[PDB]
Amino acid sequence: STITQFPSGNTQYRIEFDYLARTFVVVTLVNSSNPTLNRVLEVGRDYRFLNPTMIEMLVDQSGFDIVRIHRQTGTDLVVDFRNGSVLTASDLTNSELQAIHIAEEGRDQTVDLAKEYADAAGSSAGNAKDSEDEARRIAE
Amino acid sequence: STITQFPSGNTQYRIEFDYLARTFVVVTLVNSSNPTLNRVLEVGRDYRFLNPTMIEMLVDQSGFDIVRIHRQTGTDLVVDFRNGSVLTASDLTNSELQAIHIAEEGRDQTVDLAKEYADAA
Amino acid sequence: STITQFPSGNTQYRIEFDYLARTFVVVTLVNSSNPTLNRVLEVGRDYRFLNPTMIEMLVDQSGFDIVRIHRQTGTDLVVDFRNGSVLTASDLTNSELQAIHIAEEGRDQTVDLAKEYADAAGSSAGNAKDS
Amino acid sequence: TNIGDGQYRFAMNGNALTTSLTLESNYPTPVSIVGCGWEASYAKKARSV
Amino acid sequence: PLITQSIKNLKGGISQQPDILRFSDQGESQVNCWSSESDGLQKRPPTVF
Amino acid sequence: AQYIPLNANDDLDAINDMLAAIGEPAVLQLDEGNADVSNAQRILHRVNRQVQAKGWNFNINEAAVLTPDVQDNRIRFLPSYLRVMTAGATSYYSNMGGYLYDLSTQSTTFTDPITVELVEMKPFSEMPVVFRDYIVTKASREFNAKFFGSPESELYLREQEAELYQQVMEYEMDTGRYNMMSDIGRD
Amino acid sequence: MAQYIPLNANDDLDAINDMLAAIGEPAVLQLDEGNADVSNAQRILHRVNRQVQAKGWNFNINEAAVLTPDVQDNRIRFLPSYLRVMTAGATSYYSNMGGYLYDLSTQSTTFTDPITVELVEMKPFSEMPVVFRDYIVTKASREFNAKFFGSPESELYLREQEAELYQQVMEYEMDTGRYNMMSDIGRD
């Protein structure tokens, strides 16, 4: 849910996930055939925000086919607890949200590479084991 | 762990892992011969809850041999902090256990499945 | 990172990642030639903690070439909260850091272990087919 | 440690001839109670006197 | 409509005055009874041989 | 989230809803309890029986065969029967000593099977939802009125009951079509 | 969020917190099960949702649905998620009898071939349009106030709120469908 891809050619695109800061959003141009010519866009000279959930494009989309948008949260802490201060709800809320988000992209990343390897191994093992078991049992 | 398999031909089954909400439990019937024959059950139509650690099935077990139960934690908040309310330890405990559970499942589940298939062969 | 390699035959070694407890760090001795080889060392009789950033080998053999050091965080609540106690910043920090560390651990070892388990199952099917 | 003042309100449902209330504490902290009260709904079938 | 009244405790004994002048705690006859101070009417204890 | 319930039954929930009118909590089983749990069931059963015996499009069975005995020619009168009539004529049927009596012939001796229209009774847990809600509200009104008079618990149940009655009406009107123009045709 | 929608919200907890507001008490912050109020409120909310969903709406009525019998014994089950069962344009006789589909016209439960009907199923609370959610919450709050705690000023306002929401639900309903009365009547 944190990775989205759209066809290239339009001028306006949507954002379909939550984010804590505007610097956690990355935009990339993708060449499906040869994935060695990808380029990363930067805010201010390539794209501009319009509202909190939609952006615009200001560059030439020639030679590319897919536009990819994904989220990348940082690792540095946001709130700093110090003795003698006063406890407030907002600090706890932000602290919780950061960890939940990070775990989200971690799982979303790992499942992608895990699943095909897993079910390929499983299907091969099951097919082979059944073939061998019944084939040998019928003979004797 | 976060995955379990049981033989079919029974009426009741046990849940051993830990969860925070009853909508985080998934039940699936498994066919060893063909992976494509696997199908996912659905609450109310197929099974019902007796007590926090009991389920009763209501469908027939005709062409299946393995029953599989695993966990999938949600993504929405369970505890919300507002000023002027009473705060206890269980609140912090659950608010942290959610983030622990998500990462644990995401790291473990596929590898444990590899365990079971590989040593089954 | 989380995975490290060092050549064998050195009294002193260094760790390069943070941790929450000395029990989390796991060190094992590595030989590339034999996968069925590669035992794992233990505290006390095999190595001792000189400096929380240093490590030294008490006993070493001459049948291995590489040592393996990697992190493995547990899935238990380090901090405990009870009524009628005090709240400290250290608990609030470490409790959050735990899940974060788990994330990069899993991100690294999952895809790596996939190869060994998948091709082990495949090889087992392979010899099972003909014999 | 948290030590302060205030007021606490909770819910009590049932008939007045069957419910009961209790207080307990085995923590290393002091305790002090001042007052209490309740609210209810009444129904009668015959004037007194 | 309906009127009602109640009696709190039965601690007085018998009385032989006209009924208009009696109190609300005095009955008419009382045989083999014990008028305690905190449990109301009871039955007298037995005798051992 | 959601509200996946534990050990759901269609009778205990109705009893709990009836108890909620006064303002008491819920019970876990009906095997043991005080007078109230044993006071609500009678009213619920009576209201169910009374409502079910009004005639609806899914109750009335036009064709039904009753078969006499073989030893002594008579027909019994089971206690589950509610209405006995005839399709398109006048009828004279009644009960006399647990048997079927025909006033026209003044006899209780049938010889061949008869076809009539009758309405039977069903358990509470198989009626459509709207009927169940209507019955529960109707029972709750009486239960509140007879044992504990509160002026705020009333004045709301009537308003709810009117809407439920209406809803039952439009539900009933949609099962059948009832076109008057039928059975007419000519140049 | 101070400006935009708060992040990762929970609908059921918000509904419960709004329900408790009519009494005059602060939030609950966990939605636990030991507390007395939550258990009482949840049943009322569920009942109101089920009752409101079962009136028939343009986005809720599936005209053409297929039911099929199993193999061993020719019967069709009656799931507890069914609300209304009717026929498209003719009189129908359907009911439940011992957890099975019963046809009064033929007096049997021996369907042999797949049939087509028109039915209405139930949906989770969090997957409904906004105005319906607000209407349901207000209706549930009225009952909760009426039965468990009698306040004299919380009422006399919820009634106006309910009427105003009912109107809006109505013109929302009339807008999805066009309903032209002409409907293909043409000739020279």
Short mmCIF file of C-alpha atoms in Angstrom, two decimals, chain B residues 87-89 92-93 96-97 99-100 103-104 106-108 111 114-115 117-118 121, chain C residues 72-73 75 77 81-83 92 95-96 98-99 102-103 105-106 110 117 121 124:
data_model
loop_
_atom_site.label_atom_id
_atom_site.label_comp_id
_atom_site.label_asym_id
_atom_site.label_seq_id
_atom_site.Cartn_x
_atom_site.Cartn_y
_atom_site.Cartn_z
CA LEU B 87 -3.64 6.87 32.35
CA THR B 88 -2.55 3.38 33.45
CA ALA B 89 0.16 0.87 32.53
CA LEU B 92 1.40 1.83 27.27
CA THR B 93 1.76 -1.95 27.21
CA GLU B 96 3.91 -0.83 22.34
CA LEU B 97 2.85 -4.45 21.79
CA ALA B 99 4.30 -2.16 16.96
CA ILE B 100 6.22 -5.16 18.29
CA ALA B 103 7.48 -6.35 12.93
CA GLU B 104 7.64 -9.82 14.49
CA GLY B 106 6.61 -9.56 9.07
CA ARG B 107 10.02 -10.99 9.90
CA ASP B 108 8.96 -14.51 10.89
CA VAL B 111 10.61 -18.22 7.18
CA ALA B 114 9.78 -22.40 4.71
CA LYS B 115 10.50 -24.44 7.84
CA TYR B 117 7.39 -27.06 3.70
CA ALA B 118 11.11 -27.85 3.59
CA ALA B 121 9.43 -32.78 1.90
CA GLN C 72 19.40 -10.76 16.88
CA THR C 73 16.96 -8.80 19.04
CA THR C 75 10.65 -10.24 21.05
CA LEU C 77 9.19 -6.28 26.49
CA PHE C 81 5.28 -0.71 33.64
CA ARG C 82 3.56 -1.00 37.03
CA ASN C 83 1.25 1.20 39.06
CA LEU C 92 10.53 5.61 26.84
CA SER C 95 11.15 0.68 24.36
CA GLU C 96 10.73 2.56 21.08
CA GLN C 98 13.47 -2.05 20.18
CA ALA C 99 10.97 -2.35 17.31
CA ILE C 102 13.90 -5.43 14.77
CA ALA C 103 12.88 -3.82 11.48
CA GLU C 105 17.27 -7.01 11.38
CA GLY C 106 14.42 -8.72 9.55
CA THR C 110 14.89 -12.78 5.60
CA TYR C 117 15.67 -23.11 2.68
CA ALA C 121 13.79 -28.33 -0.24
CA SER C 124 15.55 -33.06 -1.10
#
